[PDB]
Amino acid sequence: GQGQWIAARDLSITWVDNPQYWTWKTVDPNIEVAELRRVAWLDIYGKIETKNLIRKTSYAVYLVFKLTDNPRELERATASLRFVNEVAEGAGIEGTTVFISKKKKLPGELGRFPHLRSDGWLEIKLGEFFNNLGEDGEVEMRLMEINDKTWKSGIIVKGFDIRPN
Amino acid sequence: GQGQWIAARDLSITWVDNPQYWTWKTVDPNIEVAELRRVAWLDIYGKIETKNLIRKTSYAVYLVFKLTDNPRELERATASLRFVNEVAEGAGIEGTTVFISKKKKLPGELGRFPHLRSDGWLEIKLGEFFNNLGEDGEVEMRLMEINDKTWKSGIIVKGFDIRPN
Ligand SMILES: CC(=O)N[C@@H]1[C@@H](O)[C@H](O[C@@H]2O[C@H](CO)[C@@H](O[C@@H]3O[C@H](CO)[C@@H](O)[C@H](O)[C@H]3NC(C)=O)[C@H](O)[C@H]2NC(C)=O)[C@@H](CO)O[C@H]1O
Ligand SMILES: CC(=O)N[C@@H]1[C@@H](O)[C@H](O[C@@H]2O[C@H](CO)[C@@H](O[C@@H]3O[C@H](CO)[C@@H](O)[C@H](O)[C@H]3NC(C)=O)[C@H](O)[C@H]2NC(C)=O)[C@@H](CO)O[C@H]1O
């Protein structure tokens, strides 16, 4: 539309080119997607330049994904979205907890949950930013789960959708 | 309407009613501000309803403040901004590091620094959000430094300025 698509093949996904951990698959409609078999360090990362976007526009970034029959260790994860130039020296990723595989129980339950897209894929909002003049530099965003003690499994990554709000 | 102003009186500021830690003051034009004499738990918190705000608009939220001549232990602090309903159970504050008293000495120094406003007060951006249709509830925000080993001093809090980008 007036936004940008980053297909999974163009994201930075650690371990994604080692078949023991992730499997690249072609699926309808002739797209490549990345299926996580098992990983202890899950990091799905992308970065864009705001100089290329429409000015005076708020944008949201969404991870488009699916789950297998048996997702493991992915009830919660860490989403992050920031301007690269706003990272204080020595600060960490400093993200926010979102839900990935957990289903909203009762209508009063708080948190950011995924939901179904027109194309049958799920999406979770990683964050939002305002593009003023396209001069504030790049925006990086990721969904990660870097608990060394847990094997994450069963997410299928399609890409990042970047849409005007 | 077009954004919102939270006076210091309507922010939740820890210990602010204790004259050993904060000193309430009146300054031109007949406004009450909270001067920080000394505190170890610094927390300045405020909350708005998005239903009040102009719709389909991106909003930035700033703490408006000044520094005394000899501020203490305020080079950095933690900013947070989030939709109340998006906070997952058990999640902490999950904020970002920003600079308060530190001066941007390098043109290529990274981080959010304060900006000198038209009216001579400083402002620090706590966060940003898109208001769609006013149906996503409250937004909460804070600046805090809760290192129990340091005594913060020298910030004069005027209020929160919620403004369209
Ligand atoms: C409890 C325990 O040790 N479990 C083991 C897992 O830790 C281990 O997963 C690997 O963990 C290391 C960190 O401990 C990961 O290294 C990180 O890799 C990322 C991406 O390349 C890099 O950015 C980080 O700097 C790096 N961390 C450090 C500290 O250097 C590594 O990627 C994990 N490997 C996988 C496949 O997820 C697994 C597998 O060895 O075994 C557990 O028993
Ligand atoms: C002993 C030391 O190294 N430093 C002392 C400071 O810790 C102390 O400041 C007080 O610290 C406590 C704990 O960090 C603060 O209590 C917390 O207050 C928040 C807000 O009200 C509350 O939500 C927490 O539950 C509560 N935690 C606990 C464990 O009680 C307290 O607010 C701080 N007080 C002030 C005035 O900053 C100062 C002063 O007592 O002395 C240092 O020596």
Ligand SMILES: [Cl-]
């Ligand atoms: Cl780079």
Ligand SMILES: [Zn+2]
């Ligand atoms: Zn959506």
Ligand SMILES: [Zn+2]
């Ligand atoms: Zn409210």
Ligand SMILES: [Zn+2]
């Ligand atoms: Zn210090």
Ligand SMILES: [Zn+2]
């Ligand atoms: Zn909350």
Ligand SMILES: [Zn+2]
């Ligand atoms: Zn200005």
Ligand SMILES: [Zn+2]
């Ligand atoms: Zn909504």
